[PDB]
């Protein structure tokens, strides 16, 4: 349930001593299909959401406001996430969310399934309520 | 099969943006029982094995040579690990090994039980050959 980039880098940092690349900002994103595990996702939903900017977590803070600090692991979204509303075309089915380092591409930190598959109609906001998207 | 230390550090590094510690050197040890998986462990075999010095990984290389470059995970002990011969007194039973940053104390990176429960007789080597201690 972790990416090949992140698992490679965790192993290198823990064992080799390679300095760990750090995400300057964490971006959460949705994909209609299951993201690969590799760089990029399969697939991002565009041309169906003209307003689908990957909504940044930690809207206010520059760094360290994304998640509660891990105690015995585990984190939670300190900030609510409110995605831009669906613009039109037809209803778009969302099943998987992926954490992204960059607004486009730039590696894929976490790939995890949603507990329930929410399908979005013509005009919906699709907010992440505070307390979801925990990571171990 | 990961300690609280490594989980908190990596979760912080991947999500919050906190800097990630770089262990100077990697040390392997033995444990008669399972490690407590938290900071520290219970317990190292000492005073029954007077020679128990944690054989430093990559005895020749400075850093980055102890463990093979991870590829889609996977790590392996590059340098053969040979332990000092048992001095005497009582035989010691070894099932759990722990990865340690420092020769003593200094956190616990991995805690993984050996696939087979093994004991050390009066005189024995208990070698860790190349390609052992594989971790993803």
């Amino acid at each position: 349930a972790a990416s090949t980039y992140t698992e490679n880098n965790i192993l290198n940092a823990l064992l080799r001593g390679v300095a760990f690349p750090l995400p300057a900002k964490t971006y959460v994103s949705l994909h209609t299909g299951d993201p690969g595990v590799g760089a990029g996702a399969n697939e991002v939903s565009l041309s169906n959401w003209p307003a689908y900017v990957r909504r940044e977590a930690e809207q206010g803070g520059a760094i360290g406001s994304g998640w509660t600090p891990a105690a015995s692991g585990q984190t939670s979204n300190v900030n609510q996430l409110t995605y831009p509303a669906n613009n039109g075309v037809a209803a778009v089915t969302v099943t998987h969310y992926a954490v992204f380092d960059a607004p486009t591409g730039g590696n894929l930190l976490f790939k995890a399934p949603l507990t329930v598959a929410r399908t979005l109609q013509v005009g919906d906001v699709f907010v992440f309520d505070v307390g979801s998207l925990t990571a171990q | 099969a990961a300690s609280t230390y490594t989980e908190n550090n990596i979760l912080n590094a991947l999500l919050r943006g906190v800097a990630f510690p770089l262990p100077a050197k990697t040390y392997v040890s033995l444990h008669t029982g399972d490690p407590g998986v938290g900071a520290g462990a219970n317990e190292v075999s000492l005073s029954n094995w007077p020679a128990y010095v944690r054989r430093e990984a990559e005895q020749g290389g400075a850093i980055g040579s102890g463990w093979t470059p991870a590829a889609s995970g996977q790590t392996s002990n590059v340098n053969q690990l040979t332990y000092p011969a048992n001095n005497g007194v009582a035989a010691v039973t070894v099932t759990h090994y722990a990865v340690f940053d420092a020769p003593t104390g200094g956190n616990l990176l991995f805690k993984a039980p050996l696939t087979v429960a093994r004991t050390l007789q009066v005189g024995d080597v208990f070698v860790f050959d190349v390609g052992s201690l594989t971790a993803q």
């Binding site: - | 087979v116 093994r118 004991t119």
Partner: protein
């Protein structure tokens, strides 16, 4: 392969590899793995002495056919396996 009998006990059950050793091979590391692995029938430890691997078995269930195989390594690189079946009473 041999046939073995136990009910609730642990014993030595030595297994011999000496006949195979050509010259000066030192049996080291080595691991024993069971197929019906979890719980049930567990090896508390094994000893090495004189190329004779002694694998202790804690004890199986009511009357099931449990088999376990011992894998032994050598600093020469040679590996060898022998699987002996233990019929718990």
């Amino acid at each position: 392969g041999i046939v073995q009998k136990t009910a609730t006990e642990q014993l030595d059950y030595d297994i011999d590899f000496a006949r195979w050793m050509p010259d000066g091979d030192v049996l080291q590391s080595a691991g024993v793995v069971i197929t019906p692995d979890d719980g049930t029938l567990t090896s508390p430890a094994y000893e090495i002495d004189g190329t004779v691997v002694k694998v202790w078995l804690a004890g199986g269930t009511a009357g099931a056919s449990y088999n376990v195989d011992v894998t032994v390594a050598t600093a020469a690189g040679r590996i060898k396996e022998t699987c002996f079946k233990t019929r718990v009473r």
